[PDB]
Design a protein around this nucleic acid. Structure first.
Lengths: 169, 204, 293, 159
RNA sequence: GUCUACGGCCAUACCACCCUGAACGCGCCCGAUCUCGUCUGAUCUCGGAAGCUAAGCAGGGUCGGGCCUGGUUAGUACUUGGAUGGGAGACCGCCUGGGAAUACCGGGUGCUGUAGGCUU
RNA sequence: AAACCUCCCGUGGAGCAGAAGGGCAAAAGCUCGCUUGAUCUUGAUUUUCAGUACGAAUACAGACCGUGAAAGCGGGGCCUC
RNA sequence: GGGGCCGAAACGAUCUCAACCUAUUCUCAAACUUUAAAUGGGUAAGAAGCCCGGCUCGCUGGUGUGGAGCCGGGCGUGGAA
């Protein structure tokens, strides 16, 4: 009988990391462009790593954040790939979860010879109505102590909404 | 190959510890600062025999090692290999210097020789704890360690229970009434100022 | 396991910020620039235009800083507008203009310049400023306080600025932040600024809602329907509201009835009760093990 | 020989005290300073422009010029043969009212009140301040009980 | 008694958890055409008022931490000046005055300025 | 173990060009928009001082400006060469 | 995580041994510091000070506002040793 302690989704963050730069990065931008319906935003390298072949200030990955009812449609489409199956370790200590895929073709995107296989990386941010205090301008503040979303509470929310069959371990 | 201890007996200069500025210092001779049956509780070694200095001088690390071996050598023979627990309470941090010849004093600043321990008057040098029947075994063994130290030192048997800061005549009742909890070499003082759930952890 | 950040040493080294900074209301970096006077002025007050747009009200105040605390010489709230004939829409741009206008006219009433410095009556939205009249007491001056409000084009904080300037307050300002200043072509359109002041930007929206679906129109403008507010009548309703401010800007106090004197809040617990609680808890815990054993 | 720098040895002088860093309080800025006010100097490490030299730190001066956001004062600095009445320009955060004068002003007001009073009476009330006098011989009592004997402690080696 | 707006002192105010909030309020909250800015009305800006103390916030509590203020530490450590004082020196004692800091043990957990409300 | 994204803690333990010290958290740090107060001219003061210079700096005053909605800030570099 | 041990393997079990974490404990720092002296360094201890009434200002100015300067007048009870 809680009035607005219902667990909704705040955002769905989508990111593609092609690994180095260039034509492979910009061809993966169109994959995330047509999946969401908005222009994606790239990401620069923090520093130089010769082990992974990257150097300072390099366009490595591209990411996009989806709000509203568009995010849950992508989440419902992504769980079709994952067979409504997650793991215990996918849930975070802050009551949020996420998972990564390997092929974008089964998300309704037609295959292209030039635009090859590019996997996705999903992360779901759960939230309650009242979580915008910590990121607004004037009167900030921590979002309660019993108003937070725990790891256990995030498990049962998935099991009632999408018939969670999460295997242990 | 070093100078005698007469040159560095007195605390002549300011403390000069091994730090970022004082680098290139050879390692101190003393490495282990306590030995014996150190893995022992506070209920079986309630003697706390101390070595107390009487002058304001400097104690070198090799002098501490000299009194460490000879005190330990007889103490093993007297009561047994694990019937005691000894400590040295001077850690040599002050670094003494050499003006090595081959010019005079044209730009003559010292080079480190080794470490040395500053001591005050009445500060404990060496602490030995054991059972009550080895009281005379500790006093005369500490007299043997006086010969490895420069200057005058006096032998005092303290009234403290073990290596703690509590008096030995009243150490028992706080244990029974549960104000003190032993943890290996030391004891835990429990004030009545923490959370009450900590009080509920005990007294049950 | 990993190291705990907030240890005993953390709180020992921790320096707390200012109370209003910890709460998050006062921007102390901008405060030093705003309110501090020149030392060669020798206690000349620096009046400031405080505008604070909250969720269901708009607060306009005038202040100058004394060492015990800044002095609110005059204030004006948006909830006073129903007395002047503004039943609904108290947190919009149009209501922001009236409460800015109300404060300026109220302030002139106290110091005695209701007749002098009339300001803008035919209000259009263009640039206006109060010139000091020779042989007359000088025009009042003050400086706008945005606080933490993002000062973009068309903000309600600048709506009260236009109301105060038209009321007869000589405030230095430009036309860059008023709604109508086109960002790309770099010109200010006075006709667009007039629409926001009289509230035609709300009128266009409510005309838009009634056409496309009726039920969303009921949801959005609920008390507008209850108070019988239609887009046709709002313009002269605001002009009457703008007019009614002018003759009587003085504020009357509400009479204070005798206080019932009862404590709704929970009082602070004493030391003897503090000592008794822990002894009682210890006694209950001690007898708990005795019953168990 | 040491260097001739402006801020030599100011590691602890121009440093804020413990748990007093951050934003400078606004009461120091908006204090009012007239001509002739007795002002002492304490350099604040947060602000840097208008910083007085370390030789005036802890000294007191008198205001002779007040600008927009700085106050010029005349201090008394001694340099090896004499005291110089020199003129320095310093920002507000290094400026505090000196309360050494305030005890004298409140005494003058209280003395003038007692000078107008008893003028119609004529009584010579003691007007000047006096040092601590002898302790005005008095009777001391003990309530029946005798003053308990005190005893030097025997020596025991605490260490 | 209490809240809002702007503050002064800047932890007695902060931090962690739990409980209570009548009324006004403050906010959560509903939307994006217009002003506005973003990858996304999440932020900002604007237009609102179906729900709510769930959160923010206010108050109270923790043999709470921290902080403030006291006792102890201790007239100890230190120190102005003095001696044809000691001691081989290292250093120490006395006269004269001043006078600390730990650990440990107590008490407290925001006052207050102006304007504007509620308890009519 | 370190490539990319999100949440939480985070008095600053990073960064502010350099050696070190001091100072700084809706900054003085990171990122954008616009600009050249790094412009012209009198005087006064501080720093070494002999209370002389050079260099450096500090308040001003007269102008032309930049920026910001405004208060203000800025006549080089957060201060010490 | 290295050595093993029952394990095909399993954060399943199992004695540990290692670094890490939490309460303790010994000893320090001229280029460390929460605290923090003694000795010291500036002041003020009146006539060059107060309290009044009024004029001027081209500076600042809701307001014969604020500030400064001019006047006229009264306080001697010489304002700690």
């Amino acid at each position: 009988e809680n009035p607005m302690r219902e667990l909704r989704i705040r955002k769905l963050c989508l990111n593609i990391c092609v690994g180095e730069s260039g034509d492979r990065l910009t061809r993966a931008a169109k994959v995330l462009e047509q999946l969401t319906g908005q222009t994606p935003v790239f990401s620069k390298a923090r520093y130089t790593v010769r082990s992974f072949g990257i150097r300072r200030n390099e366009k490595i990955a591209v990411h996009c954040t989806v709000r509203g009812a568009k995010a849950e449609e992508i989440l419902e489409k992504g769980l079709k790939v994952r067979e409504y199956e997650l793991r215990k370790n996918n849930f975070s200590d802050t009551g949020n979860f996420g998972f990564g895929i390997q092929e974008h073709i089964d998300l309704g995107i037609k295959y292209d010879p030039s635009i090859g296989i590019y996997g996705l990386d999903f992360y779901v941010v759960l939230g309650r109505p009242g979580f915008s205090i910590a990121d607004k301008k004037r009167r900030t503040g921590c979002i309660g102590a019993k108003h937070r979303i725990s790891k256990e509470e995030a498990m049962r929310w998935f099991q009632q909404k999408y018939d969670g069959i999460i295997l242990p371990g | 190959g070093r100078r005698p201890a007469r040159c560095y007996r007195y605390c002549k200069n300011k403390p000069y510890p091994k730090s970022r500025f004082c680098r290139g210092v050879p390692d101190a001779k003393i490495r282990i600062f306590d030995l014996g049956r150190k893995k022992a509780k506070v209920d079986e070694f309630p003697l706390c025999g101390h070595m107390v200095s009487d002058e304001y001088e400097q104690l070198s690390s090799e002098a501490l090692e000299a009194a460490r071996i000879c005190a330990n050598k007889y103490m093993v023979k007297s009561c047994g290999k694990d019937g005691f627990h000894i400590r040295v309470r001077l850690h040599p941090f002050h670094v003494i210097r050499i003006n090595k010849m081959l010019t005079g004093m044209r730009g003559a600043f010292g080079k480190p020789q080794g470490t040395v321990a500053r001591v005050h008057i009445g500060q404990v040098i060496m602490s030995i704890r054991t059972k009550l029947q080895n009281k005379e075994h500790v006093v005369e063994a500490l007299r043997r360690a006086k010969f490895k130290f420069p200057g005058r030192q006096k032998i005092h048997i303290s009234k403290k229970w073990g290596f703690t800061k509590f008096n030995a005549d009243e150490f028992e009742d706080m244990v029974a009434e549960k104000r003190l909890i032993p943890d290996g070499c030391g004891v835990k003082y429990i004030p009545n100022r923490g959370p009450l759930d900590k009080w509920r952890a005990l007294h049950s | 396991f990993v190291k705990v950040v907030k240890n005993k040493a953390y709180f020992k080294r921790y320096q707390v910020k200012f109370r209003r900074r910890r709460e998050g209301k006062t921007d102390y970096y901008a405060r030093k620039r705003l309110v501090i006077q020149d030392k060669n002025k020798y206690n000349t007050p620096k009046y400031r235009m405080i505008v604070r747009v909250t969720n269901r009200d708009i607060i306009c105040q005038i202040a100058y800083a004394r060492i015990e605390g800044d002095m609110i010489v005059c204030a004006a709230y948006a909830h006073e507008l129903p007395k002047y004939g503004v039943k609904v829409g108290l947190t919009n741009y149009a209501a922001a203009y009236c409460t800015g206008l109300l404060l300026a006219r109220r302030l002139l009433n106290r110091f005695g310049m209701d007749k002098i410095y009339e300001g803008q009556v035919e209000v259009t939205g263009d640039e206006y400023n109060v010139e000091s009249i020779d042989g007359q007491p000088g025009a009042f001056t003050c400086y706008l306080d945005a606080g933490l409000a993002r000062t973009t084009t068309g903000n309600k904080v600048f709506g009260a600025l236009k109301g105060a300037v038209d009321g007869g307050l000589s405030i230095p300002h430009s036309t860059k932040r008023f709604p109508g200043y086109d960002s790309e072509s770099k010109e200010f359109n006075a006709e667009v600024h007039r629409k926001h002041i009289m509230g035609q930007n709300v009128a266009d929206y409510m005309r838009y809602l009634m056409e496309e679906d009726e039920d969303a129109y009921k949801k959005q403008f609920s008390q507008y329907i209850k108070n019988n507010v239609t887009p046709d009548m709002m313009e002269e309703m605001y002009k009457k509201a703008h007019a009614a401010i002018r003759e009587n800007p003085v504020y009357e106090k509400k009479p204070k009835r005798e206080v019932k004197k009862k404590r709704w809040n929970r009082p602070k617990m004493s030391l003897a009760q503090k000592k008794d609680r822990v002894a009682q808890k210890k006694a209950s815990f001690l007898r708990a093990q005795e019953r168990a054993a | 020989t040491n260097t001739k720098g402006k801020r030599r040895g100011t590691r602890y002088m121009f440093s804020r005290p413990f748990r007093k860093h951050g934003v400078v309080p606004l009461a120091t800025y908006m204090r009012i300073y007239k001509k002739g006010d007795i002002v002492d100097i304490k350099g604040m490490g947060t602000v840097q422009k208008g910083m007085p030299h370390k030789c005036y730190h802890g000294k007191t001066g008198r205001v002779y010029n007040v600008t927009q956001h700085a106050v010029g004062i005349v201090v008394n600095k001694q340099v090896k043969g004499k005291i110089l009445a020199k003129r320095i320009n310093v920002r507000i955060e290094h400026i505090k009212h000196s309360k050494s004068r305030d005890s004298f002003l409140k005494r003058v007001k209280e003395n003038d009140q007692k000078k107008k009073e008893a003028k119609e009476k004529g009584t010579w009330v003691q007007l000047k301040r006096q040092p601590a006098p002898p302790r005005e011989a008095h009777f001391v009592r003990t309530n029946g009980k005798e003053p308990e004997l005190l005893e030097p402690i025997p020596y025991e080696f605490m260490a």
